[PDB]
Design a protein around this ligand. Structure first.
Ligand SMILES: [Ba+2]
Ligand SMILES: [K+]
Ligand SMILES: [K+]
Ligand SMILES: [K+]
Lengths: 90, 90, 90, 90
């Protein structure tokens, strides 16, 4: 469950990292940063400069946001909550 | 269901694209990019320069965010989940 | 219900507009734009330049996001959905 | 309940504030501002300039967003709603 979402998220981020480092010519870490802030809806820096980068970002957002938030949702409810919930027991 | 939300989203994005390319004078792809990152709450680049663009963006956000996330929600739960859920069956 | 959330949202946005136009010295429309993109989590332009503006924004976000999304949620489910739901009936 | 989420959020923000003021060399208030807009998904200003800042931000986002929104969710439903719900009684 959490494992599946984790793998799917990693694969999605790797895909984004490869795309932006290639098409937008970003250093890998910046490409990964862009992929992460975009899919978590935090932001979009550096904004794509090529039409290909803009088109891909549009599609990337619509397809990846759902996955990313599903992962964060389960990561917090099925992994972060129990660790604090149980740890709150005297 | 998913089809309806898809059509409504496309129409909303087209409307945004037409507005920003006209009033803010953006190239269509940039107008579409702005419309997408705004409604998905990712960001807002390039920020509108005219008061008309700012007013429209305010109204655009309040009316479109709900629709856009409904689409992403169903796109992920009623289309992305089944494809992975069923595909996870040996 | 929807009316209450609407009034609360308007009051919250007016408060933000007054604050930023005064402390950050922004033109009212820009102060309102900032208040809207911040509470909808879309963005934050122009970023506050004074420590007072930064502190207020921090508190503004935590107190207003919940309200704003409650309004958008009901605006879409109890107002946008019915109009399309019923209109989808031959 | 609300108290626990409040404490966890404060601790998370303090951690972010310390990190960015140290590694990114930001004034504390700017480090706190960055930590807040990032975890609430509002934005990311100023964008990290060091690879360490970018890596930390990526991890910070995934681990903190869930917590932050849980707090805002309860702050609005279990604290803001009752105050308006009960206050709406003649
Ligand atoms: Ba954002
Ligand atoms: K957001
Ligand atoms: K942003
Ligand atoms: K920005």
């Amino acid at each position: 469950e959490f494992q599946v979402l984790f793998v799917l998220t990693i694969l999605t981020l790797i895909s984004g990292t490869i795309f932006y480092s290639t098409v937008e010519g970003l250093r890998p870490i910046d490409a990964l940063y862009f992929s992460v802030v975009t899919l978590t809806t935090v932001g979009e820096t550096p904004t794509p400069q090529t039409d290909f980068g803009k088109i891909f970002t549009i599609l990337y957002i619509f397809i990846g946001i759902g996955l990313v938030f599903g992962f964060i949702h389960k990561l917090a409810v099925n992994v972060q909550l129990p660790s604090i919930l149980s740890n709150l027991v005297p």
